[PDB]
TrEMBL record:
Any one GO molecular-function label of the UniProt entry: phosphatidylethanolamine binding
Protein name: Raf kinase inhibitor
UniProt cross-references to PANTHER family, sorted A to Z: PHOSPHATIDYLETHANOLAMINE-BINDING PROTEIN (PTHR11362), PHOSPHATIDYLETHANOLAMINE-BINDING PROTEIN 4 (PTHR11362:SF82)
Domain of life assignment: Eukaryota
Recorded family membership: Belongs to the phosphatidylethanolamine-binding protein family.
Length: 190
């Protein structure tokens, strides 16, 4: 199931650094497997057809449990909103699940998880390049699993203008909440 934690080189290849993570001072220690459906998996920037991605991934596995006293937070984010091809591109958050203590999510849930922001499919506007749809795992203390600050509370992607006044990138959300970023995977969808 596990293809190997992405290297700094792999992250730089698709410009995940600096676009998503601003520098190489990231220390990933959890490998992440994601299957949207049979045969359509998220593997370090592979291109997926949007046709397979409308529903929450059928299966997600983490190579390790979180440290004692901690849980995983999973974010799915499009860092290429509105477009991969224009420099104003910012992050649109598609899914946030916290309270993750065990290694498998089946159709987006597991016992005791807390879905903070429900899954919304990529919803990518045609002709806006290959969006680097991202799955970011961070660590949160058990006691704070239900209190993540700095999250957006959106209308519909593209249809309604996003207000960026209180915008925070996942990098910055992790800083604000004192969460180590510990795992990452991505694909590209146009």
């Amino acid at each position: 199931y596990f293809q190997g934690i992405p290297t700094i080189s792999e992250l730089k290849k698709d410009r995940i650094i600096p676009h998503v993570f601003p520098n190489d001072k990231i220390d990933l220690n959890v490998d992440l497997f994601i299957s949207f459906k049979a045969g359509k998996e998220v593997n370090h920037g592979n291109v997926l057809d949007i046709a397979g991605t409308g529903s929450v991934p059928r299966n997600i596995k983490f190579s390790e449990e979180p440290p004692d006293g901690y849980c995983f937070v999973l974010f799915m984010v499009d860092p290429d909103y509105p477009s991969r091809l224009r420099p104003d591109g910012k992050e649109y958050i598609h899914w946030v699940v916290s309270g993750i203590k065990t290694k498998e999510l089946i159709k987006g849930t597991q016992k005791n998880c807390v879905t903070i922001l429900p899954y919304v499919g990529p919803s990518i506007k045609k002709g806006t390049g290959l969006h680097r749809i991202s799955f970011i795992i961070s660590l949160i203390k058990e006691e704070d699993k239900d209190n993540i600050t700095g999250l957006p509370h959106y209308g519909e992607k593209y249809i309604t203008r996003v207000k960026f006044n209180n915008y925070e990138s996942v990098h910055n959300i992790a800083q604000i909440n004192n969460m180590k970023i510990v795992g990452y995977n991505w694909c590209q969808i146009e």
